[PDB]
Structures are given as structure tokens and as C-alpha cells.
Amino acid sequence: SGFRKMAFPSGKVEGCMVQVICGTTTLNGLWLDDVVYCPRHVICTSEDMLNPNYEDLLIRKSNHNFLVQAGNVQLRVIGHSMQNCVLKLKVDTANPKTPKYKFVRIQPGQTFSVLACYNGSPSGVYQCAMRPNFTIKGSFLNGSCGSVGFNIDYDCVSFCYMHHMVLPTGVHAGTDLEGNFYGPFVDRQTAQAAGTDTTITVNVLAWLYAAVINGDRWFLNRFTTTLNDFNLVAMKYNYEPLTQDHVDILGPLSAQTGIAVLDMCASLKELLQNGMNGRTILGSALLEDEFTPFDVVRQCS
Amino acid sequence: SGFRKMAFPSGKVEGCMVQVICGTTTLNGLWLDDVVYCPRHVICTSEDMLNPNYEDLLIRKSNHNFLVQAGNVQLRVIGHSMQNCVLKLKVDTANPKTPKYKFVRIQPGQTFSVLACYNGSPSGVYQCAMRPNFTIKGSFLNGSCGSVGFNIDYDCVSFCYMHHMVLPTGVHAGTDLEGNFYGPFVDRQTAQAAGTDTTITVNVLAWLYAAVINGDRWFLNRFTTTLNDFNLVAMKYNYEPLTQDHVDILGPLSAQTGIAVLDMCASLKELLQNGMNGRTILGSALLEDEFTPFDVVRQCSG
Ligand SMILES: Cn1cnc(Cn2c(=O)nc(Nc3cc4cn(C)nc4cc3Cl)n(Cc3cc(F)c(F)cc3F)c2=O)n1
Ligand SMILES: Cn1cnc(Cn2c(=O)nc(Nc3cc4cn(C)nc4cc3Cl)n(Cc3cc(F)c(F)cc3F)c2=O)n1
Numbered sequence: 001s002g003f004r005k006m007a008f009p010s011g012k013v014e015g016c017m018v019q020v021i022c023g024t025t026t027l028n029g030l031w032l033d034d035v036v037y038c039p040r041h042v043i044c045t046s047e048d049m050l051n052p053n054y055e056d057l058l059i060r061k062s063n064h065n066f067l068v069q070a071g072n073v074q075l076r077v078i079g080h081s082m083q084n085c086v087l088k089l090k091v092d093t094a095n096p097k098t099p100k101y102k103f104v105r106i107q108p109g110q111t112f113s114v115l116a117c118y119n120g121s122p123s124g125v126y127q128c129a130m131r132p133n134f135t136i137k138g139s140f141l142n143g144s145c146g147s148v149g150f151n152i153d154y155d156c157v158s159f160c161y162m163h164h165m166v167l168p169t170g171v172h173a174g175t176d177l178e179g180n181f182y183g184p185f186v187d188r189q190t191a192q193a194a195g196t197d198t199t200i201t202v203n204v205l206a207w208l209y210a211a212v213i214n215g216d217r218w219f220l221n222r223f224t225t226t227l228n229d230f231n232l233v234a235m236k237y238n239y240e241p242l243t244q245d246h247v248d249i250l251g252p253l254s255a256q257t258g259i260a261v262l263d264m265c266a267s268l269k270e271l272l273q274n275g276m277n278g279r280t281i282l283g284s285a286l287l288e289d290e291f292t293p294f295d296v297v298r299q300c301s
Numbered sequence: 302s303g304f305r306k307m308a309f310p311s312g313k314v315e316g317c318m319v320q321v322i323c324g325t326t327t328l329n330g331l332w333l334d335d336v337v338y339c340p341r342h343v344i345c346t347s348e349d350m351l352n353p354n355y356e357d358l359l360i361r362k363s364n365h366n367f368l369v370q371a372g373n374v375q376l377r378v379i380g381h382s383m384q385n386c387v388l389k390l391k392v393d394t395a396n397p398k399t400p401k402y403k404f405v406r407i408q409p410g411q412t413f414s415v416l417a418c419y420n421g422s423p424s425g426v427y428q429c430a431m432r433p434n435f436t437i438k439g440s441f442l443n444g445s446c447g448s449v450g451f452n453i454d455y456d457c458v459s460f461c462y463m464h465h466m467v468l469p470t471g472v473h474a475g476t477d478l479e480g481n482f483y484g485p486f487v488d489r490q491t492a493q494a495a496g497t498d499t500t501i502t503v504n505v506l507a508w509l510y511a512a513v514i515n516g517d518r519w520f521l522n523r524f525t526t527t528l529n530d531f532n533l534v535a536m537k538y539n540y541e542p543l544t545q546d547h548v549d550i551l552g553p554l555s556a557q558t559g560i561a562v563l564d565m566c567a568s569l570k571e572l573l574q575n576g577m578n579g580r581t582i583l584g585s586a587l588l589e590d591e592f593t594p595f596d597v598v599r600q601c602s603g
Contacts, residue, residue, distance in 0.1 A: 001467045002440035006425035009416065011312030115310065124307035124600070125426055137584075139303040139600060170302045170516070215471075278576075283438075285586035301442050 003210055003282050003299060005290070007113040007125045008152045015097035018075070019120030020089070020146070021067040028117040028146030029068060030159070030177075032101060034094040036068050036075070037177060038146050039164050040087040041187050049189040058082050069120065070095075084179025085187045086162065100156040103177040108132045109200040109240070111292050112149040112160050119143060128161075129203070129290040132240060133195040134183025135171040136161070148177075167194055200289040201239045202246040205264055207288045208281070209253040210296045216281045220259070223266040230265040237272050249293050304511050304583050306591070307600055308414035309453045311426045316398030319376065320421025321390070321447070322368040329418040329447030330369065331463070331478075333402060335395040337369055337376070338478060339447050340465050341388040342488050350490040359383055370421060371396075385480025386488045387463065402458040404478040409433045410501040410541075412593050413450040413461050420444060429462075430591040433499045433541060435484025436472040437462070449478075468493055500590045502540045503547040506565055507594040510554040512583045514601045519580060521560065524567035531566040538573045550594050 020029040020038045023045060029038035043061055044052045061080065066089050068075040079090035106112060111129045115122055116139065128136045128149060140147070140163060149161030164174045164187055171194055173185045185192050208219065231241045247261045254261050268287075276285060321330040321339045324346060330339035342350070344358045362381070367390050369376035380391040407413065412430045416423055417440065429437045429450060441448070441464060450462030465475045465488055472495060474486045486493050509520065532542045543566065551562050569588075577586060 001442060001471055002438065002473070004427045004440040005306065006417070006427050006440060007308060009311045009315050009423040009426055011310075011315040011423075014310050014312040116307070122310040122312070125310055126305045126307045137303055139305040139307060141302070141602075166302045172302070280587070286581070299440055299442075 003214055005127050006295075006299060007127045008150065010113065010115050010122065010125045012097075012099040012152065012155075012157050013115050013148065013150055014122045015099070016095060017115070017117050017120050017122055018068055018070045020087075022061075022065055026119065026143070028120055028144070029089070030146070030148055030162070031068075031070060031075075031091075031095045031098075033098050034091055036089040036091055037162070038087050038089070039162060039175075039187065040082055040085050040179070041145065041164065042066075042087060051188060051190075054082065054187075071120070085164070085175050085181065086177065086179030102156060102158050104158045104160050105176045105178075105180070106130050106160045108134065109203055109292065110160075111290060111295055112151050114138055114149045114161070114163075115147060116140060116144055117147045127290070129200070129292075130161075130182060131171070131194075132198045132200065134181075134185075135167065135173055135194045135197070138163070138172050140166060140172055149174075165189075167192060169194060196238065199237075199239045199287070201234055201242050201268075202249065202293065203289040203291055204239075204287050205242075205246075205250055205261070205268060206253060206293040206296045207291045208264055208268060209250070209257055209259070210291065210300055211282045212257050212259065213253070213296070213300045214282060218277075218279060219267050219271055219281065220263075221267050221270055223270070224260065224263050225266040225269060226262065227265075230262070230269055233269045233272065239272075252297060253293055302515070304515055304600060306428045307596075308426045308428045309451065311414065311416050311423065313398075313400040313453070313458050314416050314449065314451055315423045317396060317400075318416070318418050318421055318423055318449075320368075320370045322370075323362070323366055327420065327444065329421055329445070330390070331447070331449055331460070332369075332371060332376075332392075332396045333399050335392055337390045337392055338463070339388055339390070340463065340476075340488065341383055341386055341480070342446065342465065343367075343388060352489055352491070355383065359388075372421075383480075386465070386476050386482060387478065387480030400458045401456055402460060405459045405461050406477045406479075406481070407431050407461045409435060410504060410593065411461075412591060412596055413452050415439055415450045415462070415464075416448060417441060417445055418448045428591070430501065430504070430593075431462075431483060432472075433501065434496045435482075435486075436468065436470075436474055436495045436498070439464075439473045441467060441473055450475075466490075468495060470495060497539075500538070500540045500588070502535055502543050502590075503550060503594065504590045504592055505540075505588050506543075506547075506551055506562070506569060507554060507597050508583070508589045508592045509565055509569060510551070510558055510560070510594075511592065511597040511601055513558045513560060514597075515583065517582055520568050520572055520582065521564075522568050522571055524571065525561070525564050526567040526570060527563065528566070531563075531570055534570045534573060540573075554594060554597060
């Protein structure tokens with residue numbers, strides 16, 4: 001019953017958010033066990049933000065230059081290190097609400113939940129997908145740097161994203177929890193452009209299945225096609241190419257509906273070659289590509 | 302940058318969700334202080350859910366017939382009562398994770414965050430609006446009965462919704478935290494109709510202001526209008542009539558953008574009479590009506 005963009009409950013992540021100040025530079029940090037993870041951009045003064053020398057900026061810092069607080073509680077810093085673009089501050093207190101967790105690096109098209117924070121305080125929760133151009137379309141204001149994205153499986157939080165910066169097109173770029181950027185970006189206040197974005201084809205098909213699995217069925221037709229023929233149409237419309245693994249992943253959704261994957265690909269081809277007739281699918285007048293096949297089954301049980 | 306449907310952090314509410322069982326009938330409850338709140342429909346067996354006599358069913362229940370489980374902690378029921386459609390089970394242990402809270406009854410058009418739960422375990426969170434016909438368009442599966450909706454003011458949790466049932470339309474219907482249904486529905490398995498819905502005009506206008514704040518400006522045009530002339534068009538497209546209180550509410554968004562409210566109404570009238578011509582606003586190809594004026598301020602600033 002119903003189909004919505006749905007985020008994971010954020011309580012386990014809320015318990016891990018702290019404020020990190022270095023000089024006057026302020027951002028959010030992630031407190032797991034006795035380590036606080038935050039973007040290394042915190043060690044940059046306004047005059048270092050455009051072209052920072054992170055090796056030289058950090059060598060001149062000491063433990064007492066980093067102020068970390070979890071609400072009113074102060075955490076004394078007893079060590080600091082740099083791993084790629086992530087600063088690691090060892091503290092004297094282990095977080096008592098540290099959850100079961102793992103650091104993972106997600107693939108384009110995969111989804112996760114974002115907890116937007118400001119000055120170490122959670123502000124809102126929503127779901128994002130990693131775009132094929134390695135950006136995300138979130139909702140972030142000044143002070144959001146260091147907010148994290150995550151998935152939860154069986155009480156284990158998989159941290160996958162740390163927000164770093166906003167790009168000129170308004171999209172957002174960040175790293176994994178090991179400090180490695182998604183995409184070719186760098187941690188510097190320079191104008192950096194994302195590539196042309198493409199549509200996650202497997203996700204659009206999964207969303208089309210969810211519609212039938214709900215009720216919308218006007219887009220279904222009598223045709224079928226081949227993976228090769230569809231991918232020729234997919235390339236023209238800035239859609240990701242479909243692989244046999246994509247076809248295999250959509251198997252469960254294809255089983256419940258009795259609609260062959262290649263039958264749905266033919267339906268999608270027609271929607272692209274003509275239009276959506278100004279009619280709506282699952283309450284939207286556009287083709288939605290930020291629902292994974294897993295997102296669909298877990299909501300359409 | 303960007304504008305999305307954004308739910309409140311659910312941590313304070315997660316620590317209050319418990320499982321309630323009565324025989325084999327199972328649903329979710331809300332544990333605050335020494336009281337667990339849940340839909341009274343839990344005291345129905347399979348053969349009772351069609352036309353239950355709740356007073357007859359309750360009189361034959363005793364404390365030990367209610368199993369309340371908070372994760373792996375078992376709670377002990379030392380009393381029970383019925384308030385409207387909500388059953389209240391007093392337990393021997395006050396919830397340590399009880400936040401500063403409040404029970405409120407929202408108005409049609411107001412939004413809240415929903416924490417969907419199954420078997421007393423939280424499962425997901427999203428934003429909903431109370432439709433003008435007192436239904437909500439959410440995402441609920443079997444076993445979601447008892448999930449709650451809420452807003453957060455700094456540290457105070459304002460509970461405004463408890464989920465009861467899915468209607469024929471597929472829409473969802475529930476009560477406030479004193480057991481009173483939003484709308485004309487009853488807690489029984491019978492076909493119930495909700496009236497025709499209408500579009501929350503003041504919420505659409507607030508959404509249009511958010512687009513201006515985020516750099517989406519193509520719909521602003523050369524016209525102005527009057528409140529009375531706009532409602533002629535609004536009544537025509539199944540929109541709520543616009544009041545002076547709506548105009549006053551949109552005041553802050555008007556002043557921050559420099560666009561008069563009546564001017565934005567005229568741009569909305571044009572959008573209603575000509576469509577969008579394949580263009581999008583804030584990444585949507587429709588007029589969104591589930592963002593209140595307060596939602597826009599909370600997200601576009603602070
Ligand atoms: C509008 N918007 C959308 N997303 C963001 C995220 N974001 C951010 O929150 N902060 C940034 N710069 C800082 C300025 C500070 C001023 N004080 C006093 N303290 C500050 C701390 C930060 Cl991090 N930036 C810009 C930015 C941050 C980076 F980490 C980076 F590598 C390059 C950048 F250009 C920012 O984008 N804002
Ligand atoms: C698809 N969907 C969307 N929303 C809902 C909510 N919902 C629900 O979760 N459960 C319901 N009936 C029960 C059956 C049970 C079987 N066992 C073993 N235990 C059960 C407990 C319940 Cl509550 N219903 C139906 C329903 C629930 C009510 F509270 C009510 F007053 C009338 C109703 F018809 C339900 O809608 N499911």
C-alpha cells in the first residue's frame with residue numbers, strides 16, 4: 001500500500017554526530033568508538049580554502065587545535081591523523097552509543113539515507129542516490145559539511161558518504177568514510193563541474209514495475225525487444241546501458257508481475273520515443289530513477 | 302541548494318516504539334512514561350474485525366492478555382482503559398527514553414513525519430500531509446498499524462497521528478493520540494469512502510516561493526490579481542479557496558523574495574490555465590502541495 005521515497009530511521013546515526021572546530025572553521029563530525037571522523041577541510045582558514053597545502057597545514061597543527069563537542073560534553077583530543085580527505089581525531093572517550101557499523105563504498109545507482117546536520121545537530125532525513133556522474137542531489141545549506149549518508153541492515157549501519165561541497169550546478173560532492181572522493185573532485189573551493197548526468201535505466205525499470213505492482217498499467221504495450229535494440233535507444237536518450245546482470249536483478253520484480261524484463265524495456269522505449277501523454281505514473285509526471293530494485297521489493301511486500 | 306521532502310530525525314521517537322499482542326492480533330504501540338498507547342483494534346480476533354463490539358470485547362480482557370515487548374525487554378501490564386479508538390495500557394516501568402512530548406491535533410494541510418514500524422521495530426521515515434479530506438497518502442504495509450506521526454520543536458516531540466487502517470482507495474486513515482479519528486472513519490473492516498480531496502492552495506504557493514529561492518524563476522510573469530479573482534480560478538481547478546490568513550502566513554516568504562503574494566497567485570493562475578509545457582519546477586513536473594510555508598523556511602534557511 002503506497003509508494004514513497006523512504007529513509008532509514010536515523011536514531012543510530014544521530015547518536016554519533018559531533019561538532020568540530022579548528023580556529024573559526026566549523027563543521028560536523030562522526031564519532032565512532034574513540035575516533036572522530038570529519039572532512040580534512042576543517043584545517044583550512046578562509047585564505048587556505050582556495051588552494052590548500054594539506055600536508056603543510058596539518059604538520060603545523062597540534063591536538064589542542066581541534067575542539068570537539070558532543071552537545072555540551074567536550075571531548076579531549078589525544079591524537080590526529082590524515083587519511084586521504086578525511087581527518088581522524090582520536091579522543092579520550094569512546095562513544096557509548098557507537099552502533100554496529102561498517103565503512104562501505106557504494107556504486108552509482110545505489111541509494112542511501114542522508115542525515116543533514118548543522119553544528120553537530122541533526123536537522124533532517126531523506127534518501128539520495130549516487131548519480132552516474134558521482135554527484136548526489138541532496139538538500140544542503142552552509143554548515144552541512146561532514147553530514148553522512150548510510151544504509152542499515154539488521155542493526156548494522158553501513159556508512160557510505162560524507163558530504164563535502166556544493167558544485168556550481170547545485171549538486172553535491174563527497175567522499176566515502178576512508179576519505180576517497182566519489183568522482184574526480186578535489187577538496188578545494190574552486191569551481192568544479194560534474195559531467196553530463198545520465199539516467200539509471202535499471203532503476204527506472206524497477207520504478208515502472210512498482211507502478212504495475214501498485215496500479216498504473218497504461219504504459220504497458222504489446223511489444224518486446226532485445227537488449228541490443230533497447231541499448232541503442234537507451235544510448236540516444238542519455239540512459240545507462242542495460243546489462244544482463246541488470247536483467248537478472250529485475251527478475252524478482254518480473255516474477256511478481258508476469259511482465260518479462262524485455263517486455264518492460266519495450267514499454268520504456270515507447271515512453272521515451274513519444275512521451276508520457278501528460279498522464280501520471282505512481283503520482284509523478286516524469287520517469288523516476290532513484291528507486292533501486294531492492295527499494296521496490298522492500299516497500300511493495 | 303536543492304529542495305526535498307525531508308522528515309525529522311526519528312531518534313527520539315524510535316526509543317518509544319513497542320510491540321503489543323493480544324492473542325494473535327499484533328500491532329505497534331507508543332511507550333511514554335508508564336503508559337503504552339495503541340489502536341484498540343488489537344483486542345479483535347479474526348472473526349471480530351468486521352463489526353466489533355469494543356466494549357463487550359474489552360470487558361472480557363484482563364491485564365495478562367496483553368503482551369507488550371520493548372525490543373527484548375518484556376513489560377508488565379498493570380492496568381488498561383479505553384479512550385475513543387485508543388487503548389491505554391499502564392505498565393510497571395516508565396520508559397527511560399521518554400522525550401519531552403505533547404499530543405496535538407493538526408489541521409488539514411499541515412505536515413508531519415511518519416515513522417513506519419512493524420512488530421515494534423522502526424522500519425522507515427517519511428513526510429506526510431493531512432489531506433483536506435482527512436486522509437493521508439503514505440506507505441504502509443501489513444503490521445504497520447500503530448505507527449505514529451510527529452513534528453519536533455527543538456527538543457519537544459509533538460505527536461499528531463497514529464495509523465489505523467488502509468481504505469478502499471489505498472489511502473490511509475488514523476486518529477490523534479486521544480483516539481479521535483481524523484475524518485469520518487471508524488475502526489472496523491468495512492468499506493469506507495473518503496470524500497473528494499482538494500489541493501492545498503497555500504502549500505503550492507509556498508512551494509513556488511521555494512523555487513524562486515533556489516533559482517527556478519521561469520513561472521514569474523507580468524500579471525497580478527486579486528484574492529477574489531484567484532479563487533474563481535481556484536474553485537475551478539479543485540483548489541482550496543485562499544483566505545486572508547493564508548496571505549498573512551505567506552508574508553515572510555513574500556518579503557524574503559520581494560515577490561508580492563497576489564503576484565505569485567497570478568503566476569499560479571497562469572500555471573493552472575496553461576500547464577507547464579514540459580518544463581519542471583524544483584525538479585517536479587507537477588504542482589506540489591505537501592510543503593507548508595513553515596517547511597520551506599525550515600529547509601531554505603536555518
Ligand atoms: C550551500 N552549501 C551546500 N552544501 C554546502 C557544504 N559546504 C559547507 O558546509 N561548508 C563549506 N565551506 C566551509 C565554510 C566555513 C565557514 N566557517 C566559519 N566554517 C566553515 C567550514 C566549511 Cl567546510 N563548503 C564549501 C567547501 C567545503 C569543502 F569541504 C571543500 F572541500 C570545498 C568547499 F568549497 C561547503 O560546500 N554548502
Ligand atoms: C496494507 N496496509 C496498509 N496499512 C495497513 C494497516 N493495517 C494493519 O497493519 N493491520 C490491519 N489489520 C490487522 C491484521 C492482523 C493480523 N494479525 C495476526 N494481527 C493483526 C492486526 C491488525 Cl491491526 N489493518 C486492517 C485494519 C486495522 C484497523 F486498526 C482497523 F480498525 C480496521 C482494519 F481493517 C490495517 O489496516 N495495512
